[PDB]
Amino acid sequence: IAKVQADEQFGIWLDSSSPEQTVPYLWSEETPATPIGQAIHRLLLIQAFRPDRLLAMAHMFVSTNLGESFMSIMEQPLDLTHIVGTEVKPNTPVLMCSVPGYDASGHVEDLAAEQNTQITSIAIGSAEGFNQADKAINTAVKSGRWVMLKNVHLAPGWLMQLEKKLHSLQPHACFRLFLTMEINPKVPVNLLRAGRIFVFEPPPGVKANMLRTFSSIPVSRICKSPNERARLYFLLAWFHAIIQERLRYAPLGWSKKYEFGESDLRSACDTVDTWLDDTAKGRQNISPDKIPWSALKTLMAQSIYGGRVDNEFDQRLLNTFLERLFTTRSFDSEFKLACKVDGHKDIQMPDGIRREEFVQWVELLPDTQTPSWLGLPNNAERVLLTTQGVDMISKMLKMQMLEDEDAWMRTLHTTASNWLHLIPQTLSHLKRTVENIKDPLFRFFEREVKMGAKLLQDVRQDLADVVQVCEGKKKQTNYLRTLINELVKGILPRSWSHYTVPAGMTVIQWVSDFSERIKQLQNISLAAASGGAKELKNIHVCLGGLFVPEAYITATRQYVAQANSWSLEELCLEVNVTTSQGATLDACSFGVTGLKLQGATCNNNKLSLSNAISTALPLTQLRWVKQTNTEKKASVVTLPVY
Amino acid sequence: IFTGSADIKHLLPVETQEFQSISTEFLALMKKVSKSPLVMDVLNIQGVQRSLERLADLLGEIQKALGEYLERERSSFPRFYFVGDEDLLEIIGNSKNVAKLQKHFKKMFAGVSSIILNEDNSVVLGISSREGEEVMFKTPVSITEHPKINEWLTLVEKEMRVTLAKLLAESVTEVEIFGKATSIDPNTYITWIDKYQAQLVVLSAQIAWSENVETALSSMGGGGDAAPLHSVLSNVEVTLNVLADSVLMEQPPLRRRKLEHLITELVHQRDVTRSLIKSKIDNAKSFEWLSQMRFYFDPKQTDVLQQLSIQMANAKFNYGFEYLGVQDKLVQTPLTDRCYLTMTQALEARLGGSPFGPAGTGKTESVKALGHQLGRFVLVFNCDETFDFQAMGRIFVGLCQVGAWGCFDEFNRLEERMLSAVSQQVQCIQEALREHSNPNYDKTSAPITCELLNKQVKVSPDMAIFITMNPGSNLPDNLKKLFRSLAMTKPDRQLIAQVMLYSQGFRTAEVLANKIVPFFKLCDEQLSSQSHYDFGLRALKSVLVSAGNVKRERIQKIKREKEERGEAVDEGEIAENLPEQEILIQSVCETMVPKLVAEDIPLLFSLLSDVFPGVQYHRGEMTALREELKKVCQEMYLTYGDGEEVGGMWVEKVLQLYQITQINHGLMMVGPSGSGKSMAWRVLLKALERLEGVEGVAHIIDPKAISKDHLYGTLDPNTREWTDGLFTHVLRKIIDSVRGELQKRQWIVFDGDVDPEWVENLNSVLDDNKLLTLPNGERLSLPPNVRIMFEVQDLKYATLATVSRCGMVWFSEDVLSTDMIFNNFLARLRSIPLDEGEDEAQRREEAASPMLQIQRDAATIMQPYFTSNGLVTKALEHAFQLEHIMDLTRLRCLGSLFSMLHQACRNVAQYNANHPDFPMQIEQLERYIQRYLVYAILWSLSGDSRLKMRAELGEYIRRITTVPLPTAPNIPIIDYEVSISGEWSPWQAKVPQIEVETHKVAAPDVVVPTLDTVRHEALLYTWLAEHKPLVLCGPPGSGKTMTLFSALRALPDMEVVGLNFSSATTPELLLKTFDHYCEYRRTPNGVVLAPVQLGKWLVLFCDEINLPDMDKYGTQRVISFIRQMVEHGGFYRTSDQTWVKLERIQFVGACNPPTDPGRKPLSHRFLRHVPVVYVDYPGPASLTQIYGTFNRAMLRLIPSLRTYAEPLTAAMVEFYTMSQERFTQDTQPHYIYSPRE
């Protein structure tokens, strides 16, 4: 803290694009540190200050240890020739595991063309596939040919039978069997144990998705009459880029990782072809204004692409994208496909009419790509990397294992001890009278406080038993040994989360959430016991500490409706973000503390788009007013509360 | 096949002769085998192997020929693929008996439930639906000219299609008049609605509206003239006003359904015409009209399957003219229109549909509505425990052959082999359908064929497969590229309730729906979670239909009272000046409040007052039934109420049960034990027999103590004859009406816990079909005079399918207060005699007996201690704080206390019998009764706890009572008996000291008397007189078994039978004990089981009641059997299926606490009946007495050491006591010390 206070040019390091090349010397030392010691010192500094670059910094750490060229073989095309000619035993099938919607058998066909080897390619769908695959393997096990089975994840039991057949096989020294499959946990574990694994991911980027989309569609369909349809296909291809890379940026790009696959593209091409054949009636040219834009927008926002969409906000996002792209204005030569790319640049749509001009423009795309291509802010990339940065560290926490014998429980004794010492021992319960049933907020707080007290008792008894195990006081039960292994790897067990809980989150942030949650529950329980029911409105309630906030919203609605004698269908919502300290609450106003605004800054109930990832909102006064039948102003935006 | 149906022989004569020869050979061979059943003798018959192989080949030939004949018939008439095997042999074998063919039409066609025939059964004149909707054929089918079954079945299908098309043409020709008239006569419209069927009415309305809108758009021409669209909108608004005025009258339910469907369709027409007018659409080829669903009728088409073409976006379909009867119309929400768009886009792309989402969002009903609107046969296959794989290949063949639709609700719930096999078949069918894409290539369909069940099956282009999924999850990988998914995460409930209310004649259907829809979500969130609460969309729809019925009832009542007076009655006028929120709150309360628990009813009323401000619900006053309830409850010593009194809630619950019997024919009482549910139905029955003057018969059956093969009957596995079960005998006795039983009203009450196994056959009669089927094959219809009832403690193991069909009443514990129990006890004791036996029980007066007067005086004495804030209630609420070996049920302690006070008045009568010179005077009576009440409260509450809690309860009683307790400082009050005089007598003074001989020093039949055994012996002597089933528990070795045996053998009339229970005790143990000791004798009152030893009361010792094992459902068969003997005074003989009664039978039992590993806790319906005593270890004083006696017995061999007897035993006790302080069970489970050591 003293060194970061004393340093003058620290600030340019704080917002640097790649600060890990210029980490400042701040650590106090007595002997001159080694290059690897300097590397771990700057690694800790990068982890502390700017974790977004942290993964990249980890690469430089490997550059300090095992050479600069260590990961240099990844970003090269895969050397299949040397591996299948030298490194693969003929009784070992080569497993090619790709993601769904992606294929890698073209590599096999290219290798079979290059090495001059005959290949029997068989896709498997039924028992005829069983018979043909067994006949092909029984002939090529003597002839020494090459046999590929494609999409073999569909029949796992027959794959178990095939592996048991292959274990007793004595093949020719150049017979090679490939099994190409999707990455799916329906595969047996022993085939991945007894095979050569290869992972084939598509290259990330908008441009590569456009190349794959344009390669998928035949040229004979695209080059049909009328001439405008290919232009539309380019727009359709752009649409299949413009959300799929957005699927890389969950939860900011979409609420969940939807299954926007190849069949959506094929159905979109089919409905575009059918509508253009119904509209043009075979003519060579039609007007851009006579294209049924509403038909395409509706059938691709509701039928083709929107069927997988369940959230209405993602449906609104898809409809805004479709209304921003699939118009007649896109046919104009001055259309910007992506505005404010890197703040000031823009992406203009090419003016060609034939397909090859579009392919040339797509090939002439710049190799630099920012999230502003998709409409996202650039700092979302700054989010996404550091999300994966967390996904590094906990994974290494999974790899701690137990092997240091010739101190896991030696650390875990103190870990469970301080986790016991953090949380209070006993949470008090609220007293049950009749006069606080007329106040629904007390019903909320009692439904909160039993759930909190039971989870407190559960965590306390489990941590007490774990710290008994760490001194040898207790015999290792299956539940206790599983719990102590989960605590070694630092993962949340299933038997610990019992309310609406964030997924994929570790145990230390979990126990910090208990500290804040039952601290807030103890404070509101003491206030409810002391001041009576009337204090229950004036207290500032954090919605994140409650196990259910929609009950709080409905309880505030009921409190207003009972206080002023109005029907529950008549009230509507209003939010005022006040910033002056000690703002006096009104009759229908309830104080909410600790909300976060992602992507904007609010001043005087007025939002402005900002490049900060999050801003801590002050005490929000949530008010319930009468449903006036006023037309909504165009300057009013509906935001979701997650 | 060759003997069950007699007409299969004439169809296959060669196979009949062949099977006759084969049967002759096989019976001769089997007679030769039956001569010698030795295995080596069967192996040594001459030429037996060649003959067996020849017979096997011949039987295989007959089977192959018959299977090919059945497959030929199934390929002839394609709907034969939808029927089972033996049903198909029944259908073809009953060609000359057409009526037997009538029951199979429901599985075959969509709505054709029967066929209307000639009087001679030679012409099939027409067809009918399930709901009585009928169609006469335009051309009749003459079955004499077409005697083959498949021939006249194809003719029936073709003529139904022809008649449906011609009637649709005439209906649209007549309704095009009403489409263009600004003024509509109600009478001609009602004549049109009553003339034609509901699907034809909705179809003609849709076709006429679509044609008029298309003609209006052609007349618009892009000139900006919105006048004809306004004209069509005004016409449909005029029809809305005409139909909403017509639905407010009194209508038959068929025409009410037709008007409801018409309102539901035409309101959507009004909304879409409003949207079309608002969006300023001027061209007929605009997408805002193309995306809406369109119809085009061509009467000039000769082909009867394409006279109506239904189009939506790019998709077009031809109307299959399948009879659907009267289905349920779906409210066309935006979600429904989006579903229609997605599924029609997937069907035009030759794909399949996957509407995925949570349960209850109208997925499968939307698929069914889409299939019905296009008029195709839809078949919903449930993917939860009703998944037969033996017929689903045949079902897929029928779907591909005749052309139909298939829906699979909850495909996520299937297991792996089901999912793999069905997904492979569906994948193969969908790939065959995707071959129909690219018709330019498919100019030759080459009669398209698919691989199914290892054969080749032709595929119709009108067929479709739909899969419904429940995520939370993704589709199987065989079909993920073949199906189009659609998220139904939330349907629009507000529009559904708006159209449902507006179809029920409600004038203000917007604000009322906007109130009621969030109220159900409020009830689902704010109320505590219960497994029988239903806040779903189906319950909301039922609530709205019931609200329409309540409004119609109020309108009819106003019309009747205005008819009686002299006033002019207009239905619109009396419907105008009338509140609708009161109707909705009345229907909501009258549906929901009987299911509510007592803790959540003021939360429900708070929510209901918040949603509906200032609206209150008033319970319907039934004054005559309440007067008969007052008479019956005053007859049977029961407290009464009239709302917010001591007993009002029980009368409210029994009135709710009366209304549920009026509404639902299957009902349950579902509250906890001891809350009045078991006799409230008898009170209602014996009040209805006085109010209506109709005889009431009740049949109480225990469902779990009697096996399913005994309850419903089992068929003979060989030599097949049908044996009736208990329920089937009851129903057969009702339906035969030999004794005129159908004139009376009969109630069958299944007094026992609910379980899915014995109710699955009851589901076929518990639904609206009301038809019980049997393995015999009889189809029995339940008469309307019968009402199936249930009595269950909880629904811990109740399936949803049975609980959805039954109206329920929750009889909570706070319905019954303790004051009602005290009133029942005092009013029983002031009127019943305790010496009458059985003769005067039918006789239920001042000078009847002196014992009645002395118990009346005792009641007068003990009444001030029986108040709400007196002694007994405070002792009960303090004893509920005490822990016991089992759960302290309130009614158990109260019944035990009442029995012991009965024994107190019996003791007073014994004093007056032994001293006839002067009676029991009032002061000594007051002292005896007031001391005995303290003694009886102490025993009846703290007889199930340790000595420290006996001392604690005695201290609390001493602090809160006025009666003087004995002065002695360190002796608890539980050791002082109340004497027959007014003073306390110590038990230590009452125990004798006996000396036992040397020959039996540790014999298992002798006992040494001490304080504890004489106390417990007096307690069993009190409890055994009134035949209460007594149970003693405690740690092992405490001596309960032989104390019970010695006290039972000491009584001169108790004949003791010692039975032992383990984890394999069926009721056959008790039945064999009754067959060994008792006998059945018939009397004109009824058959009765009695012991052979006349005058001796038989007692069944069962040594370990806890030891029978619980089932999968928390039930014990023998314990429920003993419970029904104690509660009902008898059981059922399954061989004759007749009620027997126990005459001189008791039950006593011993136990161990249920914290022991081999024990199970007892049922709360059985724990109410039993008074339970906790037998502790005897303690140091009792053991010094016992083993001082035993060592003085032992030291008679050696005569020089008498004086070393007594100093030994104390030491022999004392060290043992420190073992009981040192070697605890927690250190090691075998560190157990008892007097057995």
Q: Of B481, B487, B610, which is closest to A307 when you measure between CB atoms? A: B487
Contact (Cβ atoms closer than 8 angstroms) between residue B193 and residue B211: no
The residue of A274, A568, A570, A624 whose CB has the most chain B CBs within 10 angstroms, and thus the best one to mutate to test that interface, is A568
Contacts of A297 in chain B (CB under 8 A): none
Q: Which residues contact B259 (CB under 8 A, 6 or more apart)?
A: B193, B243, B246, B247, B251, B503
Residue with tokens 């269908």: A569
∠ CA B531-B535-B537, rounded to 5°:
130
Q: Is A215 exposed, middle or buried (0-12, 13-18, 19+ CB in 10 A)?
A: exposed
| DSSP secondary structure code for residue A495 in this structure | T
The per-residue b/e assignment along B28-46, b for 16 or more CB within 10 angstroms, e otherwise, is eeeeeeeeeeeeeeeeeee
Q: β-strands A600-603, A606-609: how paired? A: antiparallel
Q: Which ranges of B457-503 would DSSP assign to H, the alpha helix?
A: 493-502
Contact (Cβ atoms closer than 8 angstroms) between residue B150 and residue B346: no
Q: Which residues contact B1060 (CB under 8 A, 6 or more apart)?
A: B1102, B1103, B1104
Q: Which residues contact B981 (CB under 8 A, 6 or more apart)?
A: B924, B927, B928
Q: Is B296 exposed, middle or buried (0-12, 13-18, 19+ CB in 10 A)?
A: middle
Q: Which residues contact B270 (CB under 8 A, 6 or more apart)?
A: B233, B236, B237, B240
Q: Which residues contact B1216 (CB under 8 A, 6 or more apart)?
A: B1183, B1233, B1237
- Using a CB–CB cutoff of 8 Å, tell me whether B1217 touches chain A: no
Contacts of A550 in chain B (CB under 8 A): 525
**Alpha carbons A96 and A177: distance in angstroms, whole number:** 11
Residue B701: helix, strand or coil by DSSP? strand
∠ CA B244-B247-B251, rounded to 5°:
170
| DSSP secondary structure code for residue A592 in this structure | E
Q: Please give, rounded to a whole number of angstroms, the shortest distance from the CA of B811 to a CA of chain A.
A: 23
One-character DSSP codes across B207-269? HHHHHHHHHHHHHHTTSS--HHHHHHHHHHHHHHHHHHHHTTS---HHHHHHHHHHHHHHHHH
Contact (Cβ atoms closer than 8 angstroms) between residue A97 and residue A198: yes
Determine if residue B360 is labeled as part of a ligand binding site. yes
Q: β-strands A600-603, A336-341: how paired? A: unpaired
Resolution (A): 4.0
- Using a CB–CB cutoff of 8 Å, tell me whether A243 touches chain B: no
CB pairs under 8 A between A and B: 89
Residue with tokens 């993602």: A314
**Alpha carbons B1194 and B999: distance in angstroms, whole number:** 9
Q: Of A267, A275, A562, which is closest to B610 when you measure between CB atoms? A: A562
**Alpha carbons B821 and B898: distance in angstroms, whole number:** 10
Q: Which amino acid is at B533?
A: Y
Contact (Cβ atoms closer than 8 angstroms) between residue B375 and residue B319: yes
∠ CA A629-A633-A637, rounded to 5°:
110
**Alpha carbons B709 and B707: distance in angstroms, whole number:** 5
**Alpha carbons B629 and B647: distance in angstroms, whole number:** 12
Contact (Cβ atoms closer than 8 angstroms) between residue B466 and residue B408: yes
Q: Please give, rounded to a whole number of angstroms, the shortest distance from the CA of A259 to a CA of chain B.
A: 10
Determine if residue B1040 is labeled as part of a ligand binding site. yes
Determine if residue B1130 is labeled as part of a ligand binding site. no
Q: What tokens appear for A570 in the block? A: 């008549």
Residue A532: helix, strand or coil by DSSP? coil
Q: Which residues contact B827 (CB under 8 A, 6 or more apart)?
A: B637, B638
**Alpha carbons A136 and B1100: distance in angstroms, whole number:** 77
**Alpha carbons B1088 and B1139: distance in angstroms, whole number:** 8
CA distances B1048 to A86, B70, B1025, B1051, B1057, Å, are: 92, 72, 12, 6, 10
Q: Please give, rounded to a whole number of angstroms, the shortest distance from the CA of B330 to a CA of chain A.
A: 21
**Alpha carbons B501 and B511: distance in angstroms, whole number:** 10
Helix and strand tally (H, E) in chain A? Answer: 23, 14
Contact (Cβ atoms closer than 8 angstroms) between residue B358 and residue B147: no
| DSSP secondary structure code for residue B970 in this structure | T
**Alpha carbons B508 and B513: distance in angstroms, whole number:** 9
HEC readout, B897-935: HHHHHHHHHHHHHHHHHHCCCCCCCHHHHHHHHHHHHHH
Cα–Cα nearest to B317, from B447, B395, B405, B425: B405
3-state helix, strand, coil in chain B (%, to 5): 50, 10, 40
Q: Chain A residue with minimal CA distance to B515?
A: A569
By residue count, chain A amounts to: 642
Cα–Cα nearest to B1162, from B1197, B1203, B1120, B1126: B1120
Contacts of A569 in chain B (CB under 8 A): 511, 514-515, 518, 611
Contact (Cβ atoms closer than 8 angstroms) between residue B1107 and residue B1158: yes
Neighbours of A177 (CB within 10 A): 26
Contacts of A259 in chain B (CB under 8 A): 474
Contacts of A294 in chain B (CB under 8 A): 287-288
Contact (Cβ atoms closer than 8 angstroms) between residue B176 and residue B159: no
Q: Chain A residue with minimal CA distance to B528?
A: A447
Contacts of B481 in chain A (CB under 8 A): 261-263
Q: Which residues contact B300 (CB under 8 A, 6 or more apart)?
A: none
Residue A47: helix, strand or coil by DSSP? helix
**Alpha carbons B461 and A466: distance in angstroms, whole number:** 65
Report the DSSP beta bridge partners of residue A602. Answer: A607
Contact (Cβ atoms closer than 8 angstroms) between residue B901 and residue B847: no
Determine if residue B406 is labeled as part of a ligand binding site. no
3-state helix, strand, coil in chain A (%, to 5): 50, 10, 40
Contacts of B430 in chain A (CB under 8 A): none
Q: What tokens appear for A591 in the block? A: 């104080």
- Using a CB–CB cutoff of 8 Å, tell me whether B514 touches chain A: yes
**Alpha carbons B382 and B384: distance in angstroms, whole number:** 6
Long-range contacts of B70-75 (CB under 8 A, 24+ apart): B73/B149, B73/B150, B74/B394, B75/B401
**Alpha carbons B974 and B955: distance in angstroms, whole number:** 11
**Signed CA dihedral, A20, A24, A28, A33: sign only:** positive
Q: What tokens appear for B605 in the block? A: 């009323």
Q: Is B266 exposed, middle or buried (0-12, 13-18, 19+ CB in 10 A)?
A: buried
Q: Which amino acid is at B334?
A: P
**Alpha carbons B824 and B842: distance in angstroms, whole number:** 19
Q: What tokens appear for B1037 in the block? A: 């070795």
Q: Of B477, B484, B614, which is closest to A154 when you measure between CB atoms? A: B477
**Alpha carbons B551 and B502: distance in angstroms, whole number:** 13
Q: What tokens appear for B11 in the block? A: 């169809």
Q: β-strands B405-409, B378-382: how paired? A: parallel
User: Taking CB atoms and an 8 Å limit, are B341 and A299 in contact across chains?
Assistant: yes
**Alpha carbons B541 and B1037: distance in angstroms, whole number:** 63
CA distances A522 to A256, A400, A418, A555, Å, are: 35, 37, 20, 20
Residue A471: helix, strand or coil by DSSP? coil
- Using a CB–CB cutoff of 8 Å, tell me whether B450 touches chain A: no
**Alpha carbons B342 and A303: distance in angstroms, whole number:** 5
B944 phi and psi, to 5 degrees?
A: -120, 25
**Alpha carbons B625 and A374: distance in angstroms, whole number:** 74
- Using a CB–CB cutoff of 8 Å, tell me whether B57 touches chain A: no
Q: β-strands B1088-1091, B1078-1081: how paired? A: antiparallel
Q: What tokens appear for B745 in the block? A: 């009203």
Contact (Cβ atoms closer than 8 angstroms) between residue B463 and residue B405: yes
Contact (Cβ atoms closer than 8 angstroms) between residue A454 and residue A361: no
- Using a CB–CB cutoff of 8 Å, tell me whether B477 touches chain A: yes
> How was this entry determined?
cryo-EM
User: Taking CB atoms and an 8 Å limit, are B341 and A153 in contact across chains?
Assistant: no
Determine if residue B21 is labeled as part of a ligand binding site. no
Q: Please give, rounded to a whole number of angstroms, the shortest distance from the CA of B476 to a CA of chain A.
A: 9
**Alpha carbons A364 and A348: distance in angstroms, whole number:** 13
Determine if residue B678 is labeled as part of a ligand binding site. yes
Q: Which amino acid is at B792?
A: V
Q: Please give, rounded to a whole number of angstroms, the shortest distance from the CA of A529 to a CA of chain B.
A: 22
**Signed CA dihedral, B854, B859, B862, B864: sign only:** negative
Q: Please give, rounded to a whole number of angstroms, the shortest distance from the CA of B856 to a CA of chain A.
A: 41
Q: Of B341, B526, B613, which is closest to A302 when you measure between CB atoms? A: B341
Contact (Cβ atoms closer than 8 angstroms) between residue B1140 and residue B1131: yes
Q: What is the CA radius of gyration of chain B?
A: 39
State in Å, rounded, how far the first CA of chain A is from the last one. Answer: 35
Q: Chain B residue with minimal CA distance to A297?
A: B287
One-character DSSP codes across B784-822? TTEEEEEE-S--TT--HHHHTTSEEE---GGGS-HHHHH
Q: Which residues contact B384 (CB under 8 A, 6 or more apart)?
A: B410, B413
**Alpha carbons B1149 and A139: distance in angstroms, whole number:** 78
Q: Chain B residue with minimal CA distance to A311?
A: B489
Looking at chain A, the residues that come just before a C–N gap of over 2.5 A are 406
Contacts of A554 in chain B (CB under 8 A): 522, 525-526
Contact (Cβ atoms closer than 8 angstroms) between residue B1120 and residue B702: yes
Q: Which H or E element spans position B290? A: helix B287-290
Contact (Cβ atoms closer than 8 angstroms) between residue B365 and residue B354: no
CA distances A139 to A2, A167, A343, B75, B187, Å, are: 76, 17, 62, 42, 83
| DSSP secondary structure code for residue A246 in this structure | G
- Using a CB–CB cutoff of 8 Å, tell me whether B611 touches chain A: yes
**Alpha carbons B1004 and B1002: distance in angstroms, whole number:** 6
Contacts of B423 in chain A (CB under 8 A): none
Q: Of B341, B478, B515, which is closest to A154 when you measure between CB atoms? A: B478
Q: β-strands B984-986, B976-978: how paired? A: antiparallel
Cα–Cα nearest to A259, from A97, A98, A100: A100
User: Taking CB atoms and an 8 Å limit, are A565 and B485 in contact across chains?
Assistant: no
- Using a CB–CB cutoff of 8 Å, tell me whether A103 touches chain B: no
Q: What tokens appear for B124 in the block? A: 């099939």
Query: Which A positions 6-45 lie with beta carbon below 8 A of chain B?
Result: none
**Alpha carbons B488 and B409: distance in angstroms, whole number:** 13
Contacts of B484 in chain A (CB under 8 A): 267, 303, 307
The per-residue b/e assignment along A238-265, b for 16 or more CB within 10 angstroms, e otherwise, is bbbbbbbbbebbeebbbbeebebebbbb
- Using a CB–CB cutoff of 8 Å, tell me whether B1063 touches chain A: no
Q: Chain A residue with minimal CA distance to B291?
A: A295
Q: Is B171 exposed, middle or buried (0-12, 13-18, 19+ CB in 10 A)?
A: buried
Q: What tokens appear for B150 in the block? A: 């498949």
| DSSP secondary structure code for residue A364 in this structure | T
Contact (Cβ atoms closer than 8 angstroms) between residue B681 and residue B749: yes
Q: Please give, rounded to a whole number of angstroms, the shortest distance from the CA of B338 to a CA of chain A.
A: 7
Q: Which H or E element spans position A552? A: helix A550-564
The residue of B519, B606, B615 whose CB has the most chain A CBs within 10 angstroms, and thus the best one to mutate to test that interface, is B606
Contact (Cβ atoms closer than 8 angstroms) between residue B203 and residue B321: no
Cα–Cα nearest to B902, from B960, B842, B862, B844: B862
**Alpha carbons A455 and A510: distance in angstroms, whole number:** 12
Q: Is A228 left (phi over 0), alpha (psi -120 to 50) or beta?
A: alpha
Q: What tokens appear for B139 in the block? A: 């051309």
**Alpha carbons A546 and A548: distance in angstroms, whole number:** 5
Looking at chain B, the residues that come just before a C–N gap of over 2.5 A are 472, 844
Report the DSSP beta bridge partners of residue B497. Answer: none
Q: What tokens appear for A296 in the block? A: 């395409």
**Alpha carbons B127 and B321: distance in angstroms, whole number:** 14
Contacts of A559 in chain B (CB under 8 A): none
Report the DSSP beta bridge partners of residue A123. Answer: A150
Q: Is B240 exposed, middle or buried (0-12, 13-18, 19+ CB in 10 A)?
A: middle
Contact (Cβ atoms closer than 8 angstroms) between residue B1086 and residue B1131: no
A29 phi and psi, to 5 degrees?
A: -140, 160
Cα–Cα nearest to B885, from B1009, B671, B1040: B1040
Report the DSSP beta bridge partners of residue B311. Answer: B294, B316
Cα–Cα nearest to B781, from B793, B790, B772, B789: B772
**Alpha carbons B315 and A24: distance in angstroms, whole number:** 68
Contacts of A310 in chain B (CB under 8 A): 357, 487, 489
Q: Which residues contact A98 (CB under 8 A, 6 or more apart)?
A: A104, A180, A181, A182, A183, A199, A200, A201
- Using a CB–CB cutoff of 8 Å, tell me whether A602 touches chain B: no
- Using a CB–CB cutoff of 8 Å, tell me whether B470 touches chain A: no
